[PDB]
mmCIF file of all heavy atoms in Angstrom:
data_model
loop_
_atom_site.group_PDB
_atom_site.id
_atom_site.type_symbol
_atom_site.label_atom_id
_atom_site.label_comp_id
_atom_site.label_asym_id
_atom_site.label_seq_id
_atom_site.Cartn_x
_atom_site.Cartn_y
_atom_site.Cartn_z
ATOM 1 N N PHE S 10 4.399 -0.891 -7.314
ATOM 2 C CA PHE S 10 2.986 -0.437 -7.186
ATOM 3 C C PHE S 10 2.254 -0.582 -8.519
ATOM 4 O O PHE S 10 1.075 -1.047 -8.551
ATOM 5 C CB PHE S 10 2.912 1.036 -6.747
ATOM 6 C CG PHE S 10 1.515 1.405 -6.273
ATOM 7 C CD1 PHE S 10 1.104 1.321 -4.984
ATOM 8 C CD2 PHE S 10 0.618 1.978 -7.233
ATOM 9 C CE1 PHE S 10 -0.167 1.723 -4.638
ATOM 10 C CE2 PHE S 10 -0.606 2.365 -6.873
ATOM 11 C CZ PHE S 10 -1.094 2.198 -5.579
ATOM 12 N N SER S 11 2.897 0.014 -9.641
ATOM 13 C CA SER S 11 2.277 -0.125 -10.920
ATOM 14 C C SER S 11 1.952 -1.525 -11.303
ATOM 15 O O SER S 11 0.862 -1.706 -11.873
ATOM 16 C CB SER S 11 3.149 0.624 -11.903
ATOM 17 O OG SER S 11 3.254 2.031 -11.611
ATOM 18 N N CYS S 14 -0.409 -3.238 -7.537
ATOM 19 C CA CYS S 14 -1.331 -2.680 -6.651
ATOM 20 C C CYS S 14 -2.340 -1.781 -7.247
ATOM 21 O O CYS S 14 -3.397 -1.460 -6.742
ATOM 22 C CB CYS S 14 -0.533 -1.730 -5.626
ATOM 23 S SG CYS S 14 0.970 -2.425 -4.876
ATOM 24 N N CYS S 17 -6.255 -2.449 -7.765
ATOM 25 C CA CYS S 17 -7.277 -2.004 -6.727
ATOM 26 C C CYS S 17 -7.045 -0.708 -6.118
ATOM 27 O O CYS S 17 -7.981 -0.132 -5.441
ATOM 28 C CB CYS S 17 -7.241 -3.103 -5.671
ATOM 29 S SG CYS S 17 -7.479 -4.764 -6.272
ATOM 30 N N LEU S 24 -10.837 -0.160 -4.694
ATOM 31 C CA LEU S 24 -11.918 -0.628 -5.469
ATOM 32 C C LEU S 24 -12.756 -1.695 -4.953
ATOM 33 O O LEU S 24 -13.840 -1.871 -5.138
ATOM 34 C CB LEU S 24 -11.402 -1.135 -6.863
ATOM 35 C CG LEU S 24 -11.019 -0.061 -7.782
ATOM 36 C CD1 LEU S 24 -10.736 -0.724 -9.097
ATOM 37 C CD2 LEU S 24 -12.141 1.062 -7.941
ATOM 38 N N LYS S 32 -5.082 7.295 0.933
ATOM 39 C CA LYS S 32 -4.904 8.648 1.307
ATOM 40 C C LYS S 32 -4.280 8.832 2.680
ATOM 41 O O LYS S 32 -4.633 8.020 3.518
ATOM 42 C CB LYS S 32 -6.245 9.335 1.222
ATOM 43 C CG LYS S 32 -6.702 9.487 -0.175
ATOM 44 C CD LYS S 32 -8.015 10.416 -0.147
ATOM 45 C CE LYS S 32 -9.140 9.857 0.764
ATOM 46 N NZ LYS S 32 -10.365 10.600 0.463
ATOM 47 N N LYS S 33 -3.344 9.819 2.789
ATOM 48 C CA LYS S 33 -2.721 10.030 4.137
ATOM 49 C C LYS S 33 -3.704 10.053 5.306
ATOM 50 O O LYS S 33 -3.466 9.492 6.360
ATOM 51 C CB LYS S 33 -1.894 11.247 4.041
ATOM 52 C CG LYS S 33 -1.129 11.565 5.354
ATOM 53 C CD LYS S 33 -0.388 12.895 5.215
ATOM 54 C CE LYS S 33 0.071 13.389 6.625
ATOM 55 N NZ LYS S 33 0.838 14.513 6.572
ATOM 56 N N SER S 43 2.763 4.139 8.460
ATOM 57 C CA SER S 43 4.151 3.816 8.768
ATOM 58 C C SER S 43 4.561 2.712 7.936
ATOM 59 O O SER S 43 3.872 1.949 7.446
ATOM 60 C CB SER S 43 4.317 3.390 10.321
ATOM 61 O OG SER S 43 3.731 2.120 10.562
ATOM 62 N N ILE S 47 2.504 -0.830 6.853
ATOM 63 C CA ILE S 47 2.282 -1.166 5.443
ATOM 64 C C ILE S 47 2.981 -2.428 5.059
ATOM 65 O O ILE S 47 2.472 -3.311 4.471
ATOM 66 C CB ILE S 47 2.745 0.026 4.581
ATOM 67 C CG1 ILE S 47 1.773 1.130 4.908
ATOM 68 C CG2 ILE S 47 2.565 -0.434 3.074
ATOM 69 C CD1 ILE S 47 2.154 2.440 4.152
ATOM 70 N N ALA S 49 3.686 -4.960 7.034
ATOM 71 C CA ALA S 49 2.986 -6.081 7.643
ATOM 72 C C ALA S 49 1.774 -6.481 6.863
ATOM 73 O O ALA S 49 1.583 -7.615 6.601
ATOM 74 C CB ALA S 49 2.586 -5.760 9.098
ATOM 75 N N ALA S 57 -9.656 -8.962 2.375
ATOM 76 C CA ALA S 57 -9.600 -9.124 0.866
ATOM 77 C C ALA S 57 -8.322 -8.326 0.304
ATOM 78 O O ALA S 57 -8.103 -8.317 -0.868
ATOM 79 C CB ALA S 57 -10.814 -8.462 0.240
ATOM 80 N N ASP S 72 10.119 -1.443 -0.493
ATOM 81 C CA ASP S 72 10.218 -0.361 -1.401
ATOM 82 C C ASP S 72 8.742 0.214 -1.716
ATOM 83 O O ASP S 72 8.466 1.345 -1.735
ATOM 84 C CB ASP S 72 10.863 -0.645 -2.687
ATOM 85 C CG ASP S 72 12.312 -0.829 -2.449
ATOM 86 O OD1 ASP S 72 12.936 -0.412 -1.488
ATOM 87 O OD2 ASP S 72 12.948 -1.416 -3.444
ATOM 88 N N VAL S 77 4.136 4.079 -1.140
ATOM 89 C CA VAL S 77 2.838 4.442 -0.642
ATOM 90 C C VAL S 77 2.947 5.657 0.378
ATOM 91 O O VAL S 77 2.279 6.563 0.283
ATOM 92 C CB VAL S 77 2.134 3.325 0.037
ATOM 93 C CG1 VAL S 77 0.847 3.767 0.672
ATOM 94 C CG2 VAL S 77 1.788 2.303 -1.135
ATOM 95 N N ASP S 84 0.716 13.512 -2.858
ATOM 96 C CA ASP S 84 -0.389 13.563 -3.771
ATOM 97 C C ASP S 84 -1.727 13.080 -3.238
ATOM 98 O O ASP S 84 -2.718 13.609 -3.563
ATOM 99 C CB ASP S 84 -0.056 12.758 -5.001
ATOM 100 C CG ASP S 84 1.068 13.432 -5.885
ATOM 101 O OD1 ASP S 84 1.126 14.818 -5.718
ATOM 102 O OD2 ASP S 84 1.849 12.836 -6.496
ATOM 103 N N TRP S 85 -1.740 12.017 -2.425
ATOM 104 C CA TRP S 85 -3.027 11.446 -2.084
ATOM 105 C C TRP S 85 -3.303 11.852 -0.639
ATOM 106 O O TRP S 85 -3.059 11.153 0.349
ATOM 107 C CB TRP S 85 -3.093 9.980 -2.223
ATOM 108 C CG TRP S 85 -2.722 9.418 -3.572
ATOM 109 C CD1 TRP S 85 -2.992 9.977 -4.770
ATOM 110 C CD2 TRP S 85 -2.141 8.140 -3.804
ATOM 111 N NE1 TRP S 85 -2.549 9.143 -5.799
ATOM 112 C CE2 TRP S 85 -2.131 8.009 -5.211
ATOM 113 C CE3 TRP S 85 -1.724 7.016 -3.014
ATOM 114 C CZ2 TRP S 85 -1.550 6.827 -5.797
ATOM 115 C CZ3 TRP S 85 -1.233 5.990 -3.624
ATOM 116 C CH2 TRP S 85 -1.148 5.937 -5.002
#
Side-chain angles (χ1 to χ4, degrees):
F10 189 94
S11 293
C14 319
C17 305
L24 284 189
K32 292 187 298 192
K33 180 180 166 179
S43 70
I47 296 171
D72 291 341
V77 176
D84 290 329
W85 301 330

